[PDB]
Structure 1
Amino acid sequence: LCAVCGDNAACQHYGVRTCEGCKGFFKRTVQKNAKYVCLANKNCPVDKRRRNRCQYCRFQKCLAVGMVKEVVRTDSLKGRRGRL
């Protein structure tokens, strides 16, 4: 189970138990430094089924749970896979 939307989560990703959807979403967001805007009141419901209706709230729950921006690899460590 993932800490952001409650889907199946095999292991931790960037510091938090997360599924492979929010894993990639958080990764892509950090990779592109993308910014989102909530069209509601910053409380859109983030479960397995409505996670993708507001990327701001999905990313605002990624940070609330405890996802780490820095664990996503940049600078020297870009395109470097596996452990270190």
Structure 2
Amino acid sequence: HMCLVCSDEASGCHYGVLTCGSCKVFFKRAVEGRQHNYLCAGRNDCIIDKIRRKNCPACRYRKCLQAGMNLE
């Protein structure tokens, strides 16, 4: 019942991982564009939780990958 990426409430397995809906669509958008232009403003370790996941796409997106998320 918990997103592996942002620890929000998960809506099932998306792209191989238990994630919420916001993290599902975020991951899709990133891998298809787009992630090449992401740059963390901290230290590549931002907190990704429900309230702060919007802040750093670079860390969000790295969390996605590390959690296993994958297209096929």
Query: What is the SS of the residue equivalent to 2:35?
Result: coil
* CA RMSD between the two structures: 1.1
> Which residue identity lines up with residue 56 of structure 1 in the other structure?
A
Instruction: Tell me which moved more, 51-60 or 34-43.
Output: 34-43
- Which residue of structure 1 lines up, in the alignment, with residue 52 of structure 2? 50
Q: Normalising by structure 2, what TM-score?
A: 0.89
Q: Distance in 1 between the 2:35 and 2:67 partners?
A: 19
- Compare relative contact order (CA 8 Å, sep 6+) and give the higher one, 1 or 2: 2
Identity %: 47
Query: Which ranges of structure 1 fall in alignment gaps of 5 or more residues?
Result: 72-84
Query: Which ranges of structure 2 fall in alignment gaps of 5 or more residues?
Result: none
Q: How many residues align?
A: 70
Query: What is the SS of the residue equivalent to 1:51?
Result: coil
Larger Rg: 1
Q: Distance in 1 between the 2:22 and 2:14 partners?
A: 11
